[PDB]
């Protein structure tokens, strides 16, 4: 249904039952009852509905936008090029937010499955989080509520200036 | 509640109310009934001792000294009858004390379920409309021209007349309506 | 007050019940479309990018 | 992954069904109290199954049901955190509410709007379950404020008493002062972590979390009725006693302790917060256990006892023992609610009388209620192998076996003694003396609505601590090797308290005259805290708001400055300009002035 | 946009050419239908805002305000039927025409791409409002109220016109799409600072600020119920919309020219919320609460962060709905006793049990009861400010406390307590006013269910 | 004292028409105004507009952005790339000053 390469979920090595007494487990029998009584009619309703879906089946696609010159390739005052570039930048910005959200979700799920040993076994997700957060910070952070592509560009430029001046110096 | 306090409070009334408050606070201290009976006999002895003191200068001085002593050694959490000021059930039922005129807006459907009651109600309303002017004039004609009033109401001197200003004492909602 | 409540319930249900029922039918029998890849040299109409039948019907006939 | 979640959600579905009916025409015919009681009972039975599956495998879930809104880089969902805490509290609260529902069906048979009462109880229960099963802090805040408003509405059930609306407003005020810290925490976590979820907040463990932790601590102070913000809880006794047994005894007030339990992974690495918890809790315990030693209103005693136990729970949270505090939370509700319900029976029989001075012997005339009340008082005290013991014992052990402030330890032991003391005060002035109540007897405690819930809560108060403490997993490591005079210290304390109170009361039976000693007028009067604060702070607030804010500025000075200065300026310039004399001689003289001015301007500027 | 405006025009001939009896029903129904038609603007399936012409447009910021403005008209019409029942047919038609013109001009203002159309209409919304106030208000302070309302706004707006003309002469166009891509840093200078003042103070007086807010309570107190509703809900949002649109060309002067106004707003929030305690007039209480709430909008817009704009939009929508609701509730009791004092009628839960639930729910939305959208706005504004300076939460929290306090005071001393038995004229609640409260409340539930709509351009 | 009419006497609108809804003194007008209000407000608007909005797809490009973020994280984890570069614009597109 949903991709593992995006929302990975480990295999959940499960331990086998080791009953060591004579009393019955009231959960296995209640569970068989619940299955027979709930999962079967629901599963049947679902079979019927999926069949009615198979009949009159419908399709829908994912909108692919082509690449258009960024604002670097646009001129001061040319509002056409700038409009296209800025709509693109907003698209990519929304996409980057959704990426960061995917990563936060992966982190939450990892921490939950691990449990007490989440400082271990959950440092890869935290590392990816730190990384993408550093990036997001460095490319979208200090812009105001009027964020656009020119502001991101100026921020990138001042950052590269400061770094190039910290590199030229000490050389 | 039903009576209106007078202009000022006499000396005997002051003493009686001090007696009452003292005995109540003493009941509050003396929780057990025998202890209370004993110390109440003592308190009545303390009062009755200066009972025939004729002078007033010393009477008021004793009264004020007693008020001071009462404010001292005064139970901070005295007993308060529940339905009384400061009690648990003081106005607990004042939310169900809907007045009577709320029925003048009832819908004829709501009324058809209680016909006898509303016939009686119209009878009462006619009674009131008839007695109004007579009681008004009874009031205006027997106001002492001295110029000082008393807040108390007169009875229905003439026969066939209803006592003035009765529709709010009568028709008063009950005290535990549910 | 009870009259107002009765009337509000009646006039909401009068259209919300047919709507709910139509939605349940659409989702039981027609349902949602499934993702896919654009066949080469095919231009999907603007409504073939949406998922739900109501959504794309509205989109087609009004947008 | 299916059965568990199915039940966790069906519980809420069941709690909601009564309320959706209340907005329908059925409520006219069907018996709504019985319907709600049945729904609560079935919710409890259903919730028993998650509890079993957790006792078995000790697995806990994170369940995201409905995606509400995605704000850029920050998602909001209705996520549930079914851990030990949430599941056990759900089951316990549902048992207690099942009992309270019957007790109210009996205690409020005379109230016309009783269905509204049941609906409000159920709404509070739903809000509490939300506040208890929430993985997100917005959902926690929802439950928080919902509990607050439900308290306001239930305390103010009798909206003719100007003394009940006061208490409701009081509670609102204090719990909003706590909301301030709660919101501080939310803000800090939204900026420094970007998520209100706990799974993402947990990675702040290696950071400096003093600000949000102080926010949470202020919120707990406000809700659990700690010292600076205690008064609202007893004042809440203006409401019907089922409200007091449900909200202001067992579940609502417990929300602060529960919250600080839910964030214990962050307090373990901060000692400032632990020590302030310790001090606040010990001080509350002492102060309230004191104030209860001279109160004659049974409800107020049962409430100060609750405040003391909350202080003790906060102490527990101070020495890094959250699981113990939650176990005490779960074991306390049983006997505390049974205590409130015994009080409510006694009050309904004696015609609203709540003052122990007019109660007298209750053994002879209410043996069943009296036995249940004694069981409750015992469980409140140690009384080994009842529900209270299985927590309070380990509480006392942990406090007397850790590097703790000595004053806190001392006053906690003193407060356990005082617990025994006022428990015995109740048992004496209500169960062992001779009558003081009116001579007409209209006593009846045979109605099955009164007896079945009380005896269920009694079975609880007796066996539930054993059951739980044996079914739970081992969370912490208890110190089990200490001198005799520390493992037997809680029992010694309670016994000495019993004996001392017994002697003091057998003495007040004598014929000497009691007096107003200054050390009791301090207890009888809540330590003067209300008497001075509740009329000095509102005085300043409400006099400032008028004098300095409304009149001085808005009605006087802004008006004088801007509009009523512009107006005066322009009307004066008008009087100047237009008040001429109608003489052409003067007009022409002015025309000459203008001629000359123009000629001069020209001459100097250009020539 | 024409499909929303031309029907709003034809409403006028429908008002005048209609029989005296069927004039209210027709206009009310067709206004509801127009509110419906306005729901197409929510069909935004992309990040590309809707431009319908060189003049009319609608972004995620203007669409909620337009829908609210189209939805408030029928509610005002309804609320305005108990009074005017004894007025002549022509007067009723004139009132309805005033309201329709207000609707139309506001939809235009929110749809305008250019700032000169926005200004012309921003100012045209003074004529019908002033007429409503001074012609159908009841007391004599009508006139001073209208005067204040006119001249605060005009003295603020004139500099705005001068600044717009200056920007025109410097840039070539006052279009909002062009002024956003073709932008330049404003050199820090006293001239550009005065330009900032000119561009801002008109809106700041319309939000309003704390120092200049006396025109609002006078109006609300002396305005009929419809005027109060539209004013509180829309004619204040007007200033915030203007500031949000015009603050792009004032960068970065907004970084240091804001402290005065952020500060005045944060402090006047406390001052006004405190006034709302020692206030005898219910309408004045509602007005001062509105000021306390708009202070947050001003501060948020001043710091201009995404969370800030979002919270501001949510708070605008929610406050409009709930304040219109509270004024409706107050006028309900006013029509019975004809007094605005909150102390006279103080047991109304024993006669109007259902109408009290409206009081309760509103006062809960007035304060921030979650998951209300009145709360999400306050919360995100608090967060933005905390990020701004961590010492704002002090004032924010004491404001929260005072807010709970005076809302509870309102509902307690108005509904709860002992009934005033001499008030024999407390007729039961009208189905119409009950529908009014329902129509004000249900949309709050629905928005709380779907908040993605009222976020704004930032989200 | 100059001439005017005296302040009138308040009226109980339910007196003559107990089945009064608050709209008009004439009953028929009252009932039909009530019905039109209820219909066009609840049955029409609050229902059909609510549905129209609930079935608006991809509101402000929200589902599409999610799908594309999935596509991109997949591609970039499968091709070694990182999930987000600290620079939006390729520096080759950028010519920084020749500061001296
Ligand atoms: C007999 C045996 C019984 C078992 C068999 C059951 C089978 C079954 O259920 O029917 C199959 C069928 C499901 O088949 P399916 O394969 O899943 O179809 C795809 C989905 O249904 C596709 O779903 P959809 O796109 O059609 O969406 C339908 C939509 C319906 O939408 C509408 O109806 C439009 C509006 C109607 C207005 C009417 C007036 O339902 C919703 O989305 C519900 C929205 C939830 C809003 C309430 C959420 C709580 C908000 C509270 C605020 C607080 C938030 C949390 C705050 C805390 C967080 C921090 O069910 C239906 O008929 C669909 C409609 C059901 C819902 C209608 C009722 C709406 C209320
Ligand atoms: C996870 C996070 C989830 C969010 C959880 C939210 C927690 C916050 C809790 C807030 C608690 C506030 C409260 O105390 O409720 C008072 C209120 C008590 O009403 P009451 O004091 O008995 O007043 C009765 C009147 O005296 C006279 O009425 P009656 O005695 O004749 O009984 C008739 C029945 C009314 O029967 C009806 O006909 C109601 C029909 C309403 C349909 C409209 C639904 C809206 C959507 C349709 C589209 O009761 C009412 O009168 C209430 C109707 C007026 C309120 C409108 C209904 C609210 C719907 C919200 C869902 O609680 C309710 O029973 C109503 C439902 C619960 C209130 C929730 C409102 C907030 C929604 C948040 C989402
Ligand atoms: C805005 C400025 C209003 C200033 C306030 C003036 C004022 O106080 O009202 C008079 C008010 C006097 O009240 P009155 O004594 O009952 O009025 C009787 C007079 O004889 C005056 O009324 P009348 O009875 O002598 O005139 C009868 C006429 C009623 O007409 C009038 O006399 C008043 C019309 C004033 C124009 C209001 C239109 C506002 C448009 C806003 C957009 O009845 C009709 O047949 C209506 C035909 C349409 C007249 C033009 C209305 C504007 C056309 C809009 C397009 C729709 C038609 C295509 O004071
Ligand atoms: C469900 C009903 C409640 C929601 C309806 C809200 C009405 C506004 C949204 C639909 C209309 C907007 C629109 O773009 O179409 C206008 C349409 C006339 O058609 P036209 O202007 O030429 O444009 C469509 C051709 N591409 O005008 C029309 O045809 C009338 C639209 C209403 C038709 C029924 C509802 C469909 C949604
Ligand atoms: C940036 C912030 C913007 C600040 C601008 C604020 C607006 C300021 C203007 C609003 C006030 C206008 C005048 C009304 C003031 C109220 C005075 C008043 O009502 O009493 C004075 C009295 C007339 O009042 P009356 O109706 O008879 O009843 C009250 C009787 N005491 O008897 C009288 O004295 C007659 C009233 C004289 C008023 C003259 C008004 C002068 C013109 C107004 C200024 C216009 C702006 C000029 C440009 C600068
Ligand atoms: C914006 C301006 C505001 C001004 C006032 C507005 C006045 C006009 C009022 C007209 C009524 C329209 C109100 C608009 C809100 C309705 C939105 C709505 O109910 O549908 C969406 C809702 C939630 O689903 P969705 O939005 O898709 O959430 C996905 C987020 N990931 O889906 C549902 O919850 C449907 C479930 C139906 C059950 C009934 C109760 C809940 C609704």
Swiss-Prot record, chain A:
Biological process (GO), any one: proton motive force-driven mitochondrial ATP synthesis
Kindly give the membrane topology term recorded for this protein: Peripheral membrane protein
Localization recorded for this chain is: Mitochondrion inner membrane
Organism this protein belongs to: Mus musculus
Q: Residues annotated as region Disordered?
A: 1-24
Q: Give the multimer and partner information.
A: Complex I is composed of 45 different subunits. Interacts with CHCHD4.
Residue ranges with Pro residues bias:
8-18
InterPro entries membership: NADH_UbQ_OxRdtase_su10, NDUFB10
Family named by the database record = Belongs to the complex I NDUFB10 subunit family.
Q: PANTHER family under this entry? A: NADH DEHYDROGENASE [UBIQUINONE] 1 BETA SUBCOMPLEX SUBUNIT 10 (PTHR13094:SF1), NADH-UBIQUINONE OXIDOREDUCTASE PDSW SUBUNIT (PTHR13094)
Instruction: Name the UniProt key words of this record, in alphabetical order.
Output: Electron transport, Membrane, Mitochondrion, Mitochondrion inner membrane, Phosphoprotein, Respiratory chain, Transport
Q: Where is the composition biased (Basic and acidic residues)?
A: 1-7
Write down which residues bear the modification named Phosphoserine: 18, 148
Its biological function? Accessory subunit that is involved in the functional assembly of the mitochondrial respiratory chain complex I. Complex I has an NADH dehydrogenase activity with ubiquinone as an immediate electron acceptor and mediates the transfer of electrons from NADH to the respiratory chain. Accessory subunit of the mitochondrial membrane respiratory chain NADH dehydrogenase (Complex I), that is believed not to be involved in catalysis. Complex I functions in the transfer of electrons from NADH to the respiratory chain. The immediate electron acceptor for the enzyme is believed to be ubiquinone.
For this entry, the protein name equals NADH dehydrogenase [ubiquinone] 1 beta subcomplex subunit 10
Q: What is the lineage of its organism?
A: Eukaryota, Metazoa, Chordata, Craniata, Vertebrata
UniProtKB/Swiss-Prot annotation, chain C:
Membrane-spanning ranges: 10-30
Q: Which gene encodes it?
A: Ndufb5
Organism of origin is Mus musculus (Mouse)
The entry's localization annotation reads: Mitochondrion inner membrane
Q: How does it assemble?
A: Complex I is composed of 45 different subunits.
Q: Name one GO biological process term.
A: aerobic respiration
Q: Which residues of the full protein are shown?
A: 64 to 126 of 189
Question: Major location, coarse class?
Answer: mitochondrion
What function is annotated for this protein? Accessory subunit of the mitochondrial membrane respiratory chain NADH dehydrogenase (Complex I), that is believed not to be involved in catalysis. Complex I functions in the transfer of electrons from NADH to the respiratory chain. The immediate electron acceptor for the enzyme is believed to be ubiquinone.
The answer to keyword Hydrolase applying to this record is no
GO cellular component, as recorded: mitochondrial inner membrane; mitochondrion; nucleoplasm; respiratory chain complex I
**So what family is this one in?**
Belongs to the complex I NDUFB5 subunit family.
Full protein name? NADH dehydrogenase [ubiquinone] 1 beta subcomplex subunit 5, mitochondrial
Q: Would the keyword Nucleus turn up in this protein's UniProt record?
A: no
Keyword set, alphabetical order: Electron transport, Membrane, Mitochondrion, Mitochondrion inner membrane, Respiratory chain, Transit peptide, Transmembrane, Transmembrane helix, Transport
From Swiss-Prot, chain D:
Listed transmembrane segments: 3-23, 35-55, 84-104, 117-137, 140-160, 171-191, 210-230, 241-261, 272-292, 301-320, 324-344, 365-385, 405-427, 457-477, 482-502, 586-606
The record lists the catalysed reaction(s) as: a ubiquinone + NADH + 5 H(+)(in) = a ubiquinol + NAD(+) + 4 H(+)(out)
Q: Name one Pfam family in it.
A: Proton_antipo_N
One Gene Ontology biological process: mitochondrial electron transport, NADH to ubiquinone
> What top-level class of enzyme does the UniProt entry assign?
translocase
Superkingdom of this protein's organism: Eukaryota
The main location is mitochondrion
* GO CC, any one term: mitochondrial inner membrane
InterPro entries in UniProt = NADH_DH_su5_C, NADHpl_OxRdtase_5_subgr, ND/Mrp_TM, NU5C-like, Proton_antipo_N
Q: How does this protein lie in the membrane?
A: Multi-pass membrane protein
| EC number from the UniProt entry | 7.1.1.2
Q: Name one GO molecular function term.
A: NADH dehydrogenase (ubiquinone) activity
Indicate where this protein resides in the cell: Mitochondrion inner membrane
Keywords noted in UniProt = Electron transport, Membrane, Mitochondrion, Mitochondrion inner membrane, NAD, Respiratory chain, Translocase, Transmembrane, Transmembrane helix, Transport, Ubiquinone
Q: Which family does it belong to?
A: Belongs to the complex I subunit 5 family.
Cited function: Core subunit of the mitochondrial membrane respiratory chain NADH dehydrogenase (Complex I) which catalyzes electron transfer from NADH through the respiratory chain, using ubiquinone as an electron acceptor. Essential for the catalytic activity and assembly of complex I.
Quaternary structure, per UniProt, is: Core subunit of respiratory chain NADH dehydrogenase (Complex I) which is composed of 45 different subunits.
Q: Which NCBIfam families match?
A: NDH_I_L
What protein name does the entry list?
A: NADH-ubiquinone oxidoreductase chain 5
**Organism per entry:** Mus musculus (Mouse)
For this protein's source organism, the top of the classification is: Eukaryota, Metazoa, Chordata, Craniata, Vertebrata
User: Which gene underlies this protein?
Assistant: Mtnd5
Curated annotation (Swiss-Prot), chain E:
Recorded catalytic reaction(s): these are:
a ubiquinone + NADH + 5 H(+)(in) = a ubiquinol + NAD(+) + 4 H(+)(out)
Primary location class: mitochondrion
GO MF entry, a single one: NADH dehydrogenase (ubiquinone) activity
UniProt keyword terms in alphabetical order: Electron transport, Membrane, Mitochondrion, Mitochondrion inner membrane, NAD, Respiratory chain, Translocase, Transmembrane, Transmembrane helix, Transport, Ubiquinone
**GO annotation, cellular component aspect:** mitochondrial inner membrane; mitochondrion; respiratory chain complex I
The organism sits in which domain of life?
Answer: Eukaryota
Q: What EC designation does it have?
A: 7.1.1.2
**Where would you find the membrane-spanning parts of this chain?**
23-43, 60-80, 90-110, 113-133, 147-167, 194-214, 224-244, 257-277, 284-303, 308-330, 350-370, 392-412, 434-454
A single Gene Ontology biological process assigned to it is: response to nicotine
Q: Does the keyword NAD apply?
A: yes
What family, per the record? Belongs to the complex I subunit 4 family.
Main role?
A: Core subunit of the mitochondrial membrane respiratory chain NADH dehydrogenase (Complex I) which catalyzes electron transfer from NADH through the respiratory chain, using ubiquinone as an electron acceptor. Essential for the catalytic activity and assembly of complex I.
Quote the protein name from its UniProt record.
Answer: NADH-ubiquinone oxidoreductase chain 4
């Amino acid at each position: 249904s949903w991709d593992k390469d995006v929302y990975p979920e480990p295999p959940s090595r499960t331990p086998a039952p080791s009953p060591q007494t004579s009393l019955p487990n009231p959960i296995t029998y209640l569970t068989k009852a619940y299955d027979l009584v709930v999962d079967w009619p629901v599963t049947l309703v679902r079979e019927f509905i999926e069949r009615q879906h198979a009949k009159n089946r419908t399709y829908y696609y994912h909108r692919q936008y082509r690449r258009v010159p960024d604002i670097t390739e646009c001129k001061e005052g040319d509002v056409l090029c700038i409009y296209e570039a800025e709509m693109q930048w907003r698209r990519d910005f929304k996409v980057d937010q959704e990426i960061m959200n995917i990563i936060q979700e992966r982190l939450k799920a990892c921490q939950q499955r691990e449990g007490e040993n989440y400082q271990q076994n959950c440092a890869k997700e935290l590392e990816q989080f730190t990384k993408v957060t550093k990036a997001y910070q460095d490319r979208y952070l200090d812009l105001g509520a009027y964020y656009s592509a020119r502001k991101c560009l100026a921020k990138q430029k001042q950052r590269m200036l400061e770094e190039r001046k910290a590199a030229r110096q000490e050389a | 509640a039903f009576c209106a306090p007078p202009a000022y409070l006499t000396h005997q009334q002051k003493v009686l109310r001090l007696y009452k408050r003292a005995l109540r606070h003493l009941e509050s201290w003396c929780i057990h009934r025998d202890k209370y009976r004993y110390f109440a006999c003592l308190m009545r002895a303390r009062f009755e001792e200066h009972k025939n003191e004729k002078d007033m200068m010393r009477a008021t001085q004793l009264l004020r000294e007693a008020e001071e002593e009462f404010w001292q050694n005064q139970h901070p959490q005295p007993y308060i009858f529940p339905d009384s000021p400061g009690g648990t059930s003081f106005e607990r039922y004042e939310c169900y004390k809907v007045p009577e005129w709320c029925l003048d807006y009832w819908h004829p459907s709501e009324k058809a379920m209680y016909p006898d009651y509303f016939s009686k109600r119209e009878q009462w309303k006619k009674l009131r409309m008839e007695s109004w002017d007579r009681e008004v004039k009874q009031l205006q004609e027997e106001t002492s021209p001295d110029g000082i009033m008393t807040e108390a109401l007169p009875p229905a001197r003439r026969e066939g007349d209803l006592p003035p200003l009765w529709w709010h004492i009568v028709t008063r909602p009950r005290e535990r309506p549910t | 007050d009870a009259r107002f409540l009765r009337l509000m319930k009646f006039y909401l249900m009068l259209t919300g019940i047919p709507v709910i029922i139509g939605i349940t039918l659409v989702n039981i029998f027609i349902g949602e479309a499934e993702l896919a890849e654009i066949p080469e040299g095919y231009i999907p109409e603007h409504w073939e990018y949406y998922k739900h039948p109501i959504s794309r019907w509205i989109a087609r006939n009004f947008y | 992954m299916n059965i568990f979640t199915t039940s966790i959600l069906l519980i809420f579905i069941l709690l909601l069904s009564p309320i959706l009916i209340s907005m329908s025409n059925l409520i006219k015919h069907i018996n709504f109290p019985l319907y709600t009681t049945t729904s609560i009972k079935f919710s409890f039975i259903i919730s028993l199954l998650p509890l079993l599956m957790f006792f078995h495998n000790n697995m806990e879930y994170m369940i995201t049901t409905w995606h509400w809104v995605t704000m850029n880089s920050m998602e909001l969902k209705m996520s549930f955190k079914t851990d030990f805490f949430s599941i056990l509290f759900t089951s316990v609260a549902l048992f207690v509410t099942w009992s309270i529902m019957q007790f109210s069906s009996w205690y409020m048979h005379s109230d016309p709007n009783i269905n509204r009462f049941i609906k409000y109880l159920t709404l509070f229960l739903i809000t509490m379950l939300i506040l208890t099963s929430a993985n997100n802090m917005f959902q926690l805040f929802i439950g928080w404020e919902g509990v607050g408003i439900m308290s306001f509405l239930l305390i103010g059930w009798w909206y003719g008493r100007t003394d009940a609306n006061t208490a409701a407003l009081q509670a609102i005020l204090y719990n909003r002062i706590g909301d301030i810290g709660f919101i501080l925490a939310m803000v800090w976590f939204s900026l420094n972590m970007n998520s209100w979820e706990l799974q993402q907040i947990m990675f702040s463990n290696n950071n400096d979390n003093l600000i949000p932790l102080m926010g949470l601590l202020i919120a707990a102070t406000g809700k659990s009725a700690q010292f600076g913000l205690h008064p609202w809880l007893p004042s809440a006794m203006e409401g019907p006693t089922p409200v007091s047994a449900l909200l202001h005894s067992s579940t609502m007030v417990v929300a602060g302790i529960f919250l600080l339990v839910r964030f214990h992974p962050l307090t373990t690495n901060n000692n400032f917060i632990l020590t302030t918890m310790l001090c606040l809790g010990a001080l509350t315990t002492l102060f309230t256990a004191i104030c209860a030693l001279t109160q004659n209103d049974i409800k107020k005693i049962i409430a100060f006892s609750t405040s003391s136990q909350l202080g003790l729970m906060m102490v527990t949270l101070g020495m890094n023992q959250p699981h113990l505090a939650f176990l005490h939370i779960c074991t306390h509700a049983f006997f505390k609610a049974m205590l409130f319900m015994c009080s409510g029976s006694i009050i309904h029989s004696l015609a609203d009388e709540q003052d122990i001075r007019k109660m007298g012997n209750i053994t002879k005339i209410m043996p069943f209620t009296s036995s249940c009340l004694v069981i409750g008082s015992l469980a409140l005290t140690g009384m080994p192998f009842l529900t209270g013991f299985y927590s309070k014992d380990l509480i006392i052990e942990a406090i007397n076996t850790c590097n703790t402030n000595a004053w806190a330890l001392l006053i906690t032991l003193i407060a356990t003694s005082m617990t025994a003391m006022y428990s015995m005060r109740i048992i004496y002035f209500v169960t062992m003396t001779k009558p003081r109540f009116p001579p007409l007897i209209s006593i009846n405690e045979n109605d099955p609505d009164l007896m079945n819930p009380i005896k269920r809560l009694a079975f609880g108060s007796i066996f539930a601590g054993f059951v739980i403490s044996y079914n739970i997993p081992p969370t912490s490591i208890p110190v089990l090797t200490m001198p005799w005079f520390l493992k037997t210290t809680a029992l010694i304390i309670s016994v000495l308290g019993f004996l001392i109170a017994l002697e003091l009361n057998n003495l007040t039976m004598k014929l000497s005259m009691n007096k107003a000693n200054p050390y009791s007028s301090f207890s009888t009067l809540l330590g003067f805290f209300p008497s001075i604060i509740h009329r000095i702070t509102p005085m300043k607030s409400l006099n400032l708001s008028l004098k300095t804010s409304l009149t001085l500025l808005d009605l006087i000075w802004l008006e004088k400055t801007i509009p009523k200065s512009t107006s005066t300026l322009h009307t004066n310039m008008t009087t100047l300009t237009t008040n001429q004399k109608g003489l052409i001689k003067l007009y022409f003289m002015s025309f000459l002035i203008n001629i000359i001015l123009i000629i001069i301007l020209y001459s100097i500027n250009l020539e | 946009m024409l499909k929303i405006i031309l029907p709003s025009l034809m409403l006028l001939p429908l008002t005048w050419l209609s029989s005296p009896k069927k004039t209210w029903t027709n206009v009310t129904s067709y206004s509801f239908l127009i509110s419906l038609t306005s729901l197409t603007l929510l069909w935004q399936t992309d990040e590309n805002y809707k431009n319908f012409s060189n003049m009319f447009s609608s972004d995620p910021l203007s669409t909620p305000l337009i829908i609210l403005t189209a939805w408030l008209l029928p509610l005002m019409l309804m609320a305005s039927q108990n009074h005017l029942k004894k007025d002549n047919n022509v007067l009723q038609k004139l009132y309805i025409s005033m309201l329709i013109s207000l609707q139309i001009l506001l939809i235009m203002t929110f749809s305008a791409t250019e700032l000169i159309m926005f200004y012309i209409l921003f100012e045209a919304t003074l004529i019908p409002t002033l007429i409503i106030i001074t012609r159908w208000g009841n007391q004599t302070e009508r006139l001073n109220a209208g005067i204040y309302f006119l001249f605060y706004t005009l003295i603020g707006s004139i500099p705005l016109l001068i600044a717009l003309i200056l920007i025109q002469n410097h840039v070539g166009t006052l279009n909002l799409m062009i002024l956003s891509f073709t932008t330049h840093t404003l050199d820090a200078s006293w001239s550009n600072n005065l330009l900032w003042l000119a561009c801002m103070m008109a809106f700041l007086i319309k939000m309003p600020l704390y120092g200049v807010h006396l025109w609002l309570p006078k109006a609300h107190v002396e305005a009929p119920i419809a005027g109060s509703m539209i004013l509180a809900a829309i004619l204040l949002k007007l200033g915030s919309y203007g500031m949000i649109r015009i603050s792009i060309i004032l960068d970065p002067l907004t970084k240091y020219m804001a402290y005065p106004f952020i500060l005045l707003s944060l402090w006047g929030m406390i001052m006004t919320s405190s006034i709302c305690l020692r206030q005898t007039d219910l309408k004045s209480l509602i007005a001062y609460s509105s000021v306390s709430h708009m202070a947050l909008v001003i501060a948020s817009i001043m710091i201009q962060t995404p969370w800030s704009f979002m919270g501001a939009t949510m708070l605008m929508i929610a406050h409009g709905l709930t304040s219109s609701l509270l004024f409706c509730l107050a006028n309900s009791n006013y029509e019975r006793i004809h007094s605005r004092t909150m102390i006279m009628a103080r047991g109304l839960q024993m006669v109007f049990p259902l109408m009290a639930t409206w009081w309760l729910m509103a006062s809960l939305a007035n304060l921030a009861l979650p998951p209300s959208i009145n709360l999400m706005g306050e919360l995100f504004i608090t967060m933005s400010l905390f990020s701004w300076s961590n010492f704002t939460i002090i004032l924010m929290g004491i404001n929260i406390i005072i807010t709970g306090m005076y809302s509870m005071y309102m509902i307690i001393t108005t509904q709860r307590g002992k009934l005033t038995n001499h008030m024999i004229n407390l007729q039961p609640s009208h189905t119409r006013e009950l529908t009014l409260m329902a129509l004000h409340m249900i949309p709050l539930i629905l928005l709380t269910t779907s908040p993605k709509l009222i976020t704004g351009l930032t989200m | 004292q100059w001439q005017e009419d005296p302040e009138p006497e308040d009226e109980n609108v339910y007196a003559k028409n107990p089945d009064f809804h608050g709209y008009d003194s004439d009953p028929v007008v009252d009932v039909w105004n009530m019905r039109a209000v209820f219909f066009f407000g609840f049955s029409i608007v609050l229902v059909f507009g609510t549905t129209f909005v609930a079935y608006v797809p991809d509101y402000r490009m929200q589902e599409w952005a999610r799908r594309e973020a999935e596509r991109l994280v997949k591609y970039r984890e499968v091709n070694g790339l990182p999930i987000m570069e600290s620079n939006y614009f390729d520096p080759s597109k950028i010519q920084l000053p020749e500061d001296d």
